[PDB]
Amino acid sequence: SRIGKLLGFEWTDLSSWRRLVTLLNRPTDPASLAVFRFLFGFLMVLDIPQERGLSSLDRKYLDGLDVCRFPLLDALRPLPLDWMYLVYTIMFLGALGMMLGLCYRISCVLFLLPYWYVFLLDKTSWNNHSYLYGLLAFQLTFMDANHYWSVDGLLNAHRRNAHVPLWNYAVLRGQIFIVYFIAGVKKLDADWVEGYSMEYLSRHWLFSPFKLLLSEELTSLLVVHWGGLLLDLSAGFLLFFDVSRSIGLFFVSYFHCMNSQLFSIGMFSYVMLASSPLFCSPEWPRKLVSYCPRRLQQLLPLKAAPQPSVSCVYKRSRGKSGQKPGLRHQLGAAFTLLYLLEQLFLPYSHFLTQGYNNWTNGLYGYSWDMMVHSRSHQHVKITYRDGRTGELGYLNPGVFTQSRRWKDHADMLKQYATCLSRLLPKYNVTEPQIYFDIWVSINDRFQQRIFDPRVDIVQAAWSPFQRTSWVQPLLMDLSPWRAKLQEIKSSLDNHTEVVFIADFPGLHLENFVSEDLGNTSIQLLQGEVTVELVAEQKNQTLREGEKMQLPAGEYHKVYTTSPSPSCYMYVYVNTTELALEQDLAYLQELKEKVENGTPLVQTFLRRQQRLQEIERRRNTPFHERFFRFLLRKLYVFRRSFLMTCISLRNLILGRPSLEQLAQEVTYANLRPFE
Amino acid sequence: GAAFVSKQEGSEVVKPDPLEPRDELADHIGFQEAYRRFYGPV
């Protein structure tokens, strides 16, 4: 029975439905589950005011604002601001009750429902760790996590030290393993393997030990990319098995400690650190409190044999032959199996919902594809056509939006176009006809259009289960040009800049050259283009390898005339900044000479003086920065509390008057210690 | 007015992003009038 010690069960336990049900309901020590519940509740309590947006609620959900939102379902609408504050208060109470283990099930539901409502209210705030928090809350709703280290055991001692079914830990370990393994499998992509996704990360000072034995490129490739992929692929296997648990624990601890400093991901790293000890023995906290000195062993609750509970069945050779599996046991086993199957299927179900498939598959947030893709937006142009007269107009990019994520998805763009068609009549525009022109680059690559600029999106057809016709395909046959592009970029001076563009056949690009760029030129790399000067009405054709100078403060047009996509580049240098810098440098030397013998210099020298005060900060001990950090956190907490109190009093009693509200809001922004 | 640009300013082409990391909310259009209508002269 080497298998029996390797995986904790036998092959005969998975031969029949009854045997599987009996195995998956075996009693277990609930100490580790209780500690994880406590930590997750505490982290969620601390995370609600910061990342969920309680401290910016009065800015986000102002009652009379003109704004376009992006919900998953258009029938879902937000509530008035006071009711939003009430929703956040209920969520906070649920999180606190989950942390303390008081009224566990009701508190779990009270946290779960408003949290998921708020999550579904806005697609542009979806990411992987918020989705993970929702999944964890849903999982913990059905578990017996209040059998230890809780206040439901200090009020009724029958739920004290009572066992739990086996699948409680199995589902959580499966979730963690799924996250790790699917993240690793998603990192089996050509951009990650070749080292394009995170190429500036290795320059951080935290990587300095590794640069003693390796160059910068080797540190970027071997450590950040290949090492991360190997850790993702092996973390679950290392944590599961007993022989390699300590080594894997050290690796994951280092990984999450480094990630907590390299990025700004909220509380994800601490959640992962707290979830790692779920792979140890279910009685490890008992051993931990046993290993403490005996002087600290008389105040903690007495350590006794855990009492039986009805949530788990007991099978013994002597203590009764067995019991028939009740409805609860079969329900739990079915929940475990179906939930794990659904969690495996969902990140790979993009072949059914084709209306959310852009260059990248599906909506972002539930596929564990973290940090694999990076985007750069060069230009966004929105133009409308008046349906009553026919004038052409141009909108500011994102007038009524509160985010920028709409530039990458067709569903969000359709929602935004509908918003604009509804809202523009209030600004003297009749039956608008709206077109979009968006240029994006992904993991370097030439800039190109993502949507068709000749399609009126208001009447464009979109469906959740159909491939979108107006989405442009990604030009993945020009990827091997990236090394040459990097060579060209590095082969320049420190005053000249370059922009690379690839254009589909049949489309043109109208560009206005600013008056500050007197020395600008275009050079063709592939295909063939025809360049037009609008003022002189002159057409000139460029062949591969030849360049052209362009006038400043004028319009010009670039037509792609080849049957295949053509690539060119823009080279320019900002002339005004050149003169500004070369006169400021002369003035500084003149000042030095006058010593030895202008508002612009004033502003520049002030900015560098405060940057040298930042250098002093570098010399200043870290305790000052820690004090500033604590003060900022205290400010945001106090402001959120006071705003919630004001809104709740308005709900319960009524709005007093404008002046009293003004005084209360003025007090709420007091900046306690600055 | 504040929702419209010129053709010159819209055509200026020459003027990275990860979606896992998580604030000019007060620079919305018409924000101040609504804020004073809801909260008074703050």
Ligand SMILES: CCCCCCCC/C=C/CCCCCCCC(=O)OC[C@H](COP(=O)(O)OCCN)OC(=O)CCCCCCC/C=C/CCCCCCCC
């Ligand atoms: C053999 C079937 C899969 C079981 C795990 C195989 C281990 C090999 C590599 C996987 C690494 C970790 C997998 C994810 C963790 C979930 C499984 C788990 O926790 O099982 C442990 C636990 C024993 O734990 P302890 O007694 O503490 O022993 C620990 C050993 N020191 O074992 C069980 O609870 C038995 C679980 C039976 C299988 C149920 C879980 C797996 C479900 C499969 C997911 C897909 C859904 C349905 C699949 C349909 C087709 C089969």
Ligand SMILES: CCCCCCCC/C=C\CCCCCCCC(=O)OC[C@H](COP(=O)(O)OCCN)OC(=O)CCCCCCC/C=C/CCCCCCCC
């Ligand atoms: C006067 C107050 C009245 C009440 C007093 C009670 C509160 C005081 C005591 C508790 C201290 C924590 C509350 C205040 C902390 C404020 C700081 C804070 O949360 O900041 C978030 C900060 C991140 O900062 P950002 O702003 O993202 O970084 C800057 C870039 N934007 O997050 C943190 O530092 C998290 C700190 C909490 C960690 C505690 C949990 C760690 C758990 C990991 C343990 C690992 C193993 C556990 C094993 C058991 C597992 C079952």
Ligand SMILES: CCCCCCCC/C=C\CCCCCCCC(=O)OC[C@H](COP(=O)(O)OCCN)OC(=O)CCCCCCC/C=C/CCCCCCCC
């Ligand atoms: C329902 C809560 C689930 C929470 C999501 C967490 C991650 C789940 C992964 C899926 C993410 C997105 C796929 C969802 C498919 C269904 C989407 C849907 O019905 O609504 C889309 C669309 C709205 O389009 P917008 O772009 O807002 O409008 C554009 C014009 N302004 O809605 C409609 O077209 C009307 C209704 C469509 C058909 C209704 C559904 C009938 C078929 C049921 C299957 C669909 C859902 C299955 C759920 C999968 C389980 C997770």
Ligand SMILES: CC(C)CCC[C@@H](C)[C@H]1CC[C@H]2[C@@H]3CC=C4C[C@@H](OC(=O)CCC(=O)O)CC[C@]4(C)[C@H]3CC[C@]12C
């Ligand atoms: C004499 C007059 C000026 C009264 C002003 C007192 C304020 C400074 C008090 C009133 C409300 C207090 C807040 C009420 C609630 C909390 C929640 C509390 O939440 C926790 O995170 C504690 C539990 C945990 O650690 O998880 C942290 C302190 C804080 C922000 C308090 C900080 C201090 C505040 C703002």
Ligand SMILES: C/C(=C\Cc1c(C)c(O)c2ccccc2c1O)CCC[C@H](C)CCC[C@H](C)CCCC(C)C
């Ligand atoms: C950019 C990176 C990961 C993206 C990511 C993040 C941020 C997570 O939070 C994840 C959490 C769970 C699952 C997947 C996650 C994920 O995919 C790692 C790249 C940088 C990293 C710090 C390098 C690690 C060094 C390697 C592991 C070897 C060093 C070992 C020494 C002790 C010798």
Ligand SMILES: *[C@@H]1O[C@H](CO)[C@@H](O[C@@H]2O[C@H](CO)[C@@H](O)[C@H](O)[C@H]2NC(C)=O)[C@H](O)[C@H]1NC(C)=O
């Ligand atoms: C416009 O800018 C380009 C690029 O900055 C200039 O071309 C450089 O000219 C110098 C000669 O002084 C050469 O040493 C560089 O190798 C050239 N670089 C490139 C990329 O060609 C060009 O001279 C500038 N034009 C004017 C009128 O100043």
Ligand SMILES: *[C@@H]1O[C@H](CO)[C@@H](O[C@@H]2O[C@H](CO)[C@@H](O)[C@H](O)[C@H]2NC(C)=O)[C@H](O)[C@H]1NC(C)=O
């Ligand atoms: C310069 O050449 C381009 C094409 O390379 C011309 O653009 C075409 O103009 C006609 C007339 O309006 C349109 O029907 C076509 O759709 C345009 N594009 C193409 C690809 O043919 C442009 O008119 C020329 N300019 C001058 C002054 O002759």
Ligand SMILES: CC(C)CCC[C@@H](C)[C@H]1CC[C@H]2[C@@H]3CC=C4C[C@@H](O)CC[C@]4(C)[C@H]3CC[C@]12C
């Ligand atoms: C009415 C308001 C307040 C609450 C609405 C709650 C509903 C919509 C919430 C509660 C629990 C949520 C579910 C929790 C877990 C999962 C599993 C995941 O893999 C897909 C989403 C899915 C299936 C969620 C969909 C939305 C859900 C069903």
Ligand SMILES: *[C@@H]1O[C@H](CO)[C@@H](O)[C@H](O)[C@H]1NC(C)=O
């Ligand atoms: C060139 O620099 C000036 C200030 O030095 C700046 O105002 C201008 O916007 C720059 N040119 C471009 C095209 O951004």
